[PDB]
Design an enzyme around this catalytic site. Structure first.
Site, PDB file in Angstrom:
ATOM      1  N   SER A  49       0.809  -1.218   0.000  1.00  0.00           N
ATOM      2  CA  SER A  49       0.000   0.000   0.000  1.00  0.00           C
ATOM      3  C   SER A  49       0.837   1.261   0.000  1.00  0.00           C
ATOM      4  CB  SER A  49      -0.963   0.044   1.185  1.00  0.00           C
ATOM      5  OG  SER A  49      -2.028  -0.852   0.976  1.00  0.00           O
ATOM      6  N   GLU A  88      -4.825  -3.558  -7.549  1.00  0.00           N
ATOM      7  CA  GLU A  88      -5.265  -4.173  -6.305  1.00  0.00           C
ATOM      8  C   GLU A  88      -6.217  -5.327  -6.567  1.00  0.00           C
ATOM      9  OE1 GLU A  88      -3.899  -3.398  -3.605  1.00  0.00           O
ATOM     10  OE2 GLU A  88      -3.235  -1.312  -3.723  1.00  0.00           O
ATOM     11  N   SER A 115       0.885  -3.400   4.057  1.00  0.00           N
ATOM     12  CA  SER A 115       1.013  -4.759   4.562  1.00  0.00           C
ATOM     13  C   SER A 115       0.791  -5.712   3.403  1.00  0.00           C
ATOM     14  CB  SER A 115      -0.039  -5.093   5.635  1.00  0.00           C
ATOM     15  OG  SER A 115      -0.057  -4.169   6.707  1.00  0.00           O
TER      16      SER A 115
HETATM   17  C1  LIG Z   1      -1.813  -2.045   1.616  1.00  0.00           C
HETATM   18  O1  LIG Z   1      -0.688  -2.498   1.773  1.00  0.00           O
HETATM   19  N1  LIG Z   1      -2.939  -2.885   1.763  1.00  0.00           N
HETATM   20  C2  LIG Z   1      -4.244  -2.270   1.735  1.00  0.00           C
HETATM   21  C3  LIG Z   1      -4.535  -2.154   3.206  1.00  0.00           C
HETATM   22  N2  LIG Z   1      -3.477  -1.368   3.828  1.00  0.00           N
HETATM   23  O2  LIG Z   1      -3.746  -1.072   5.155  1.00  0.00           O
HETATM   24  S1  LIG Z   1      -2.436  -0.901   5.918  1.00  0.00           S
HETATM   25  O3  LIG Z   1      -1.540   0.091   5.216  1.00  0.00           O
HETATM   26  O4  LIG Z   1      -2.829  -0.410   7.312  1.00  0.00           O
HETATM   27  O5  LIG Z   1      -1.653  -2.189   5.947  1.00  0.00           O
HETATM   28  C4  LIG Z   1      -4.570  -3.550   3.836  1.00  0.00           C
HETATM   29  C5  LIG Z   1      -3.304  -4.357   3.615  1.00  0.00           C
HETATM   30  C6  LIG Z   1      -2.798  -4.255   2.181  1.00  0.00           C
HETATM   31  C7  LIG Z   1      -3.479  -5.286   1.271  1.00  0.00           C
HETATM   32  N3  LIG Z   1      -3.059  -6.625   1.410  1.00  0.00           N
HETATM   33  O6  LIG Z   1      -4.340  -5.014   0.440  1.00  0.00           O
END
Ligand SMILES: *C(=O)N1C[C@H](NOS(=O)(=O)O)CC[C@H]1C(N)=O
Length: 265
Positions: free
Chosen positions: A47, A143, A214
């Site tokens: 993200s 995504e 994450s």
């Molecule tokens: C980004 O890495 N994602 C979208 C969302 N992000 O929230 S976080 O930055 O607090 O981790 C959830 C995790 C991730 C995804 N797997 O889509």
């Protein structure tokens, strides 16, 4: 690399204690000094790639300021794995300002995909990164597949050094127009997902903007601009990824990495 011997020792020990691969870059914008650990290896951005995407859209808005207020329809079909804001607008519209705030401050993945669509896809975010002198950033997927974070996979990666330099140019420097840079910095300062990450390792009085991420392999990421009290800002990137696909996230690793870099400044 201007990292002191002591800081290298501390970041190395932190990585070993956490059983993963840690990448850290810190820029002191007052001196231009840059320091860190594995700062030239590729890491999956997850993200944190959303900053470059929103910045690309803000660059486009410089020539069409009404672009950010244009309503964009949101459909059930746009929803993916994590849609905390956009799920409330199915069958309605959101502006690109709302979509940018959602993707930066809540990490809404459907909002990211809507922004990618307007820009022409991940390949056009990569072209924008090149336009600001970032030759390491690559966004390959949308995504949610851009978060697979597989060891050895170069897709959807950047380096701590390149991401730090880009975040400096975008949020502090002159890569964007003044209105756009200030909007980006405000959105980063209003992030809601970062309390346990870089922010937790810094003095509580400092102003901080950040974007977390994450993914699989326990990938735990954060990129930050920091305005310490009385002195020029810092840019901190902390990327962390782990050996097994199902590893749990380790936000305290990023907090400790931030505390390590913060002390040495
Ligand atoms: C980004 O890495 N994602 C979208 C969302 N992000 O929230 S976080 O930055 O607090 O981790 C959830 C995790 C991730 C995804 N797997 O889509």
């Amino acid at each position: 690399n201007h990292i002191q011997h002591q800081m290298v020792q501390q970041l190395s020990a932190l990585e070993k204690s956490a059983n993963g691969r840690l990448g850290v870059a810190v820029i002191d914008t007052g001196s231009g000094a840059i320091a860190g650990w594995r700062m030239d290896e590729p890491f999956p951005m997850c993200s944190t790639s959303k900053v470059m995407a929103v910045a690309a859209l803000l660059k486009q808005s410089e020539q069409t300021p009404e672009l950010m207020s244009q309503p964009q329809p949101v459909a059930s079909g746009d929803l993916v794995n994590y849609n905390p804001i956009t799920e409330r607008f199915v069958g309605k519209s959101m502006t690109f300002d709302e979509l940018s705030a959602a993707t930066l401050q809540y990490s809404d993945n459907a909002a990211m995909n809507l922004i990618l669509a307007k820009l022409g896809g991940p390949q056009k975010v990569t072209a924008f990164a090149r336009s600001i002198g970032d030759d390491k950033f690559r966004l390959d997927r949308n995504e949610p597949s851009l978060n697979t974070a597989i060891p050895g996979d170069l897709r959807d990666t950047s380096t701590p050094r390149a991401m730090a330099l880009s975040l400096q140019k975008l949020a502090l420097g002159d890569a964007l127009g003044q209105v756009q840079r200030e909007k980006l910095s405000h959105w980063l300062r209003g992030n809601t997902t970062g309390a346990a990450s870089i922010r937790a390792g810094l003095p509580s009085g400092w102003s901080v903007g950040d974007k977390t991420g994450s993914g699989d392999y326990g990938t735990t990421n954060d990129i930050a601009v920091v305005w310490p009290t009385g002195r020029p800002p810092l840019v901190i990137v902390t990327y962390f990824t782990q050996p097994q696909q199902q590893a749990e996230s380790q936000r305290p690793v990023l907090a400790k990495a931030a505390a390590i870099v913060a002390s040495h400044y």
